[PDB]
Design a protein around this ligand. Structure first.
Ligand SMILES: [Cl-]
Ligand SMILES: [Cl-]
Ligand SMILES: [Cl-]
Ligand SMILES: [Cl-]
Ligand SMILES: [Cl-]
Ligand SMILES: [Cl-]
Ligand SMILES: [Cl-]
Ligand SMILES: [Cl-]
Ligand SMILES: [Cl-]
Ligand SMILES: [Cl-]
Ligand SMILES: [Mn+2]
Ligand SMILES: [Mn+2]
Ligand SMILES: [Mn+2]
Ligand SMILES: [Mn+2]
Ligand SMILES: [Mn+2]
Ligand SMILES: [Mn+2]
Ligand SMILES: [Mn+2]
Ligand SMILES: [Mn+2]
Ligand code: NA
Ligand code: NA
Length: 215
């Protein structure tokens, strides 16, 4: 069940400069996060062609945030030449295509890197339990397209396309404890998500490849 070699994450400084690599496990231990260990990540927000946002629910088997709802795909570029590539954020866009297939079963041809749009970067920290957490500079990637979903149940328990109002209702259910959402998704929904969603045809104003936002 466990792979022979551990997956590697890209270690970065607070300015998103590559400074090394560490195992996925080590990158997500609270004890290391508290020493400042920070890694590169991405977060895909995919909208269908009626502007419904695609949410995933993480499988109960995931190490961090099992069973939690979040946006379309939250994962990491690998520490290899393909995904280390920083020109036009190609590395993270390639990573996103890779994980859209692995997690949601979306064929590669449906989401080529060229159609994955890099908006901005957000630096955040979160805790999952007593052992595990998150600490990332997260590339925000936006997609609007109809895709064919066949998730790997080992990765994804369910998915849901939500309108703005449906999301608002879902967040109410999370607040009452009826369902679980990741700390990332909670904070992004509270800060930027609806601003982007109200402006899907005018996103250029939100493109910022210089400033790294903090939340
Ligand atoms: Cl992990
Ligand atoms: Cl460390
Ligand atoms: Cl809309
Ligand atoms: Cl494919
Ligand atoms: Cl384009
Ligand atoms: Cl489903
Ligand atoms: Cl909540
Ligand atoms: Cl999170
Ligand atoms: Cl629209
Ligand atoms: Cl604009
Ligand atoms: Mn567990
Ligand atoms: Mn995915
Ligand atoms: Mn993240
Ligand atoms: Mn380059
Ligand atoms: Mn936090
Ligand atoms: Mn930090
Ligand atoms: Mn991470
Ligand atoms: Mn959660
Ligand atoms: Na499913
Ligand atoms: Na608009």
């Amino acid at each position: 069940q466990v792979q022979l070699l551990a997956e590697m994450c890209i270690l970065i400084d607070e300015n998103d400069n590559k400074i090394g690599a560490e195992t996925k496990k080590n990158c997500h231990l609270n004890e290391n996060i508290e020493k400042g260990l920070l890694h590169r990540a991405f977060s895909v927000f995919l909208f269908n062609t009626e502007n419904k946002l695609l949410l995933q629910q993480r499988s109960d088997a995931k190490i961090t945030f099992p069973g939690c709802f979040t946006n379309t795909c939250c994962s990491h570029p690998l520490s290899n030449p393909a995904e280390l590539e920083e020109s036009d954020a190609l590395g993270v866009r390639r990573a996103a295509q890779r994980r859209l297939k692995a997690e949601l079963g979306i064929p590669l041809e449906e989401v080529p890197p060229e159609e994955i749009n890099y908006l901005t970067r957000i630096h955040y920290k979160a805790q999952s339990d007593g052992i595990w957490g998150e600490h990332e500079i997260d590339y925000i990637l936006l997609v609007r397209m109809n895709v064919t979903l066949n998730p790997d149940p080992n990765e994804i328990k369910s998915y849901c396309y939500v309108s703005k109002e449906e999301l608002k209702e879902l967040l109410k259910k999370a607040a009452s404890g009826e369902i679980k959402i990741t700390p990332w998704f909670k904070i992004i929904a509270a800060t930027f998500l609806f601003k982007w969603w109200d402006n899907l045809n005018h996103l250029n104003q939100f493109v910022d490849h210089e400033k790294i936002y903090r939340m």
